[PDB]
Amino acid sequence: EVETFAFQAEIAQLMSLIINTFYSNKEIFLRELISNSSDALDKIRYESLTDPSKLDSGKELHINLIPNKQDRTLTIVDTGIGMTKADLINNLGTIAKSGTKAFMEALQAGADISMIGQFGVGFYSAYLVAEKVTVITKHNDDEQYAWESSAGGSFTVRTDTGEPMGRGTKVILHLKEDQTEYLEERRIKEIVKKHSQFIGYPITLFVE
Amino acid sequence: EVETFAFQAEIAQLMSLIINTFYSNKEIFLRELISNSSDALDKIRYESLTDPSKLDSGKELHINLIPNKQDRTLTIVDTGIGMTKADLINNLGTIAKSGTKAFMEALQAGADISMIGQFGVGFYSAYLVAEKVTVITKHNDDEQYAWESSAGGSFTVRTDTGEPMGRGTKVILHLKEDQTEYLEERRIKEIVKKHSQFIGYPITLFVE
Numbered sequence: 001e002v003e004t005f006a007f008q009a010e011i012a013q014l015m016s017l018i019i020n021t022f023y024s025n026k027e028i029f030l031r032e033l034i035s036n037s038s039d040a041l042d043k044i045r046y047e048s049l050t051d052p053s054k055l056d057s058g059k060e061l062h063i064n065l066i067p068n069k070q071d072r073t074l075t076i077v078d079t080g081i082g083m084t085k086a087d088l089i090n091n092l093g094t095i096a097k098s099g100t101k102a103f104m105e106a107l108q109a110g111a112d113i114s115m116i117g118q119f120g121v122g123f124y125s126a127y128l129v130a131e132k133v134t135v136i137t138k139h140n141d142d143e144q145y146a147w148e149s150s151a152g153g154s155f156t157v158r159t160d161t162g163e164p165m166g167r168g169t170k171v172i173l174h175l176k177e178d179q180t181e182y183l184e185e186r187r188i189k190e191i192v193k194k195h196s197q198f199i200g201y202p203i204t205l206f207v208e
Numbered sequence: 209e210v211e212t213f214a215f216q217a218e219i220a221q222l223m224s225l226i227i228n229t230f231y232s233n234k235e236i237f238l239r240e241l242i243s244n245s246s247d248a249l250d251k252i253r254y255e256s257l258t259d260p261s262k263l264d265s266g267k268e269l270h271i272n273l274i275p276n277k278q279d280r281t282l283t284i285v286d287t288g289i290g291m292t293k294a295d296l297i298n299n300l301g302t303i304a305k306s307g308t309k310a311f312m313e314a315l316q317a318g319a320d321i322s323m324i325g326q327f328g329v330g331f332y333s334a335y336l337v338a339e340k341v342t343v344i345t346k347h348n349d350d351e352q353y354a355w356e357s358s359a360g361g362s363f364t365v366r367t368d369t370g371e372p373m374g375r376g377t378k379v380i381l382h383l384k385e386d387q388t389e390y391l392e393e394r395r396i397k398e399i400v401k402k403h404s405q406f407i408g409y410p411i412t413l414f415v416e
C-alpha cells in the first residue's frame with residue numbers, strides 16, 4: 001500500500017524556494033548529498049565501535065555515484081546507517097521545520113542557496129536539479145522503504161520489494177531535462193574534486 | 209571512584225599534534241565547540257519531534273559562553289542531548305580513530321589545523337588554548353559524569369555529584385597562561401560573529 005503524506009508547510013515553502021528562485025550555482029546539490037551520506041556512514045561506524053554486529057548487514061562503508069543517461073538519473077548510494085520509516089516521514093532524519101526558518105532568515109540577511117547545508121536541510125537541494133527524487137533506504141531496525149516526491153506539496157512512502165540493499169540509502173535523482181550535464185563523467189569528477197575532496201569514505205564514480 | 213583510561217594511540221597522536229604544532233589561528237577552537245553543541249541540540253530536538261517527553265529534562269535549547277577571569281576558565285554550556293558514560297569513553301561521541309587518520313593525511317596533502325571539524329574531531333581543538341579540559345555531561349539515559357584530561361595520554365571519568373544540569377554538556381576550558389584573550393568580552397564577541405553567525409540556537413555571552 002502506497003501512503004501519501006503532506007509536507008509540513010515550512011518544507012513545502014523551502015522546496016518552492018529551491019525550485020523557483022533564480023540561482024545558477026546548482027552543482028552544490030552533489031556536495032550536500034555526499035555530506036549526508038558521509039554523516040550516515042559515520043553514524044553506523046560509531047554504533048559498530050561498541051556493537052560489531054551492527055555491520056552484519058554489510059561491512060563496506062562507501063559512496064557510489066551512478067549516472068544513467070538512458071533513464072536520465074544520477075543515483076547516490078551509501079552504506080550508512082539508513083533511515084527507518086519514521087525517519088523518512090520525519091523529513092528524512094532532519095529538523096527541517098527549524099532548519100528552514102533559520103535558512104530563510106539567513107537568505108534575507110545576506111546568504112545564498114549554496115549555504116543550505118549549514119541549516120541541516122541540504123537534502124532538499126536535490127530539487128535544484130531533479131524533477132523527482134526517490135530515496136530507497138534500509139536501517140537495521142526496520143524494513144526497506146522507498147520515499148518519493150516530485151514536490152507539489154506531497155511525498156509517498158511504500159515498502160520496496162525489489163533489489164535488497166542490506167543497509168544504507170540510495171538517492172535517485174530523476175534529472176530535469178536541462179540538467180543532464182550532471183550525468184557527464186567529467187562534470188561529476190570536477191564537482192567531487194571541487195567540493196568533496198575531504199570525505200573520509202571511498203567515492204566511486206561508475207562508468208557507462 | 210575516579211577511573212583513569214588511556215587514549216587510543218591515534219587520539220594521543222592527534223592531541224600531541226594539536227599541542228606541539230606551531231599554528232597561530234587558535235581562535236577556531238570556539239567555533240568547533242559551538243558546532244558540537246549545535247549538533248547535540250539538533251539531536252535532542254529531532255528525538256523530541258516523535259517523543260515530547262525527551263524534553264522533560266529541560267525544554268530550553270541554548271548555548272551559553274561563560275568566561276571567568278578569576279578561575280582562568282572559559283565554559284561552553286549547551287542543553288543538547290548530552291553524552292552517556294560510554295559516549296564519553298568512546299572519544300566523546302566521535303569516530304576519532306578514523307577521523308584522525310583522514311585529518312593527518314589532509315594536513316600532509318595541503319590542509320591546516322582550522323579544518324579539523326571537517327574530520328569530526330573538532331572537540332580536540334580545545335587543546336589549542338586549554339591546558340586541561342573538563343566535560344560535565346548528562347544524557348536522559350544515564351547519570352551526570354565528568355570527563356577530564358590534561359593530555360599526556362590519559363583521561364579520567366567520574367560521577368559528578370555537584371550542580372545537577374538536567375540535560376546537556378558543559379565544556380570547561382582551563383586556559384593556558386598565554387591564552388587569556390579568550391576571556392575578554394570583545395574577543396569572544398568577535399569570534400562568535402566571525403565564525404558562528406549562522407548557528408540556530410541563542411548563544412549568550414555572560415558578563416563578569
Ligand SMILES: O=c1[nH]nc(-c2ccc(O)cc2O)n1-c1ccccc1F
Pocket residue numbers: 033035036037039040041043078080081082083087092093094123168169171
Ligand atoms: O541518518 C541517516 N541515515 N541515512 C541518512 C541519509 C539521509 C539523506 C541522504 O542524502 C543520505 C543518507 O544516507 N541519514 C541522515 C544524514 C544526514 C542528516 C539526516 C539523516 F537522517
Ligand SMILES: O=c1[nH]nc(-c2ccc(O)cc2O)n1-c1ccccc1F
Pocket residue numbers: 241243244245247248249251286288289290291295300301302331376377379
Ligand atoms: O551527541 C552529543 N551530545 N553532546 C555532545 C557534545 C560533544 C562535544 C561538545 O563540545 C559538546 C556537545 O554537546 N555530542 C556530540 C556532538 C558532536 C559530535 C559528537 C557528539 F557526541
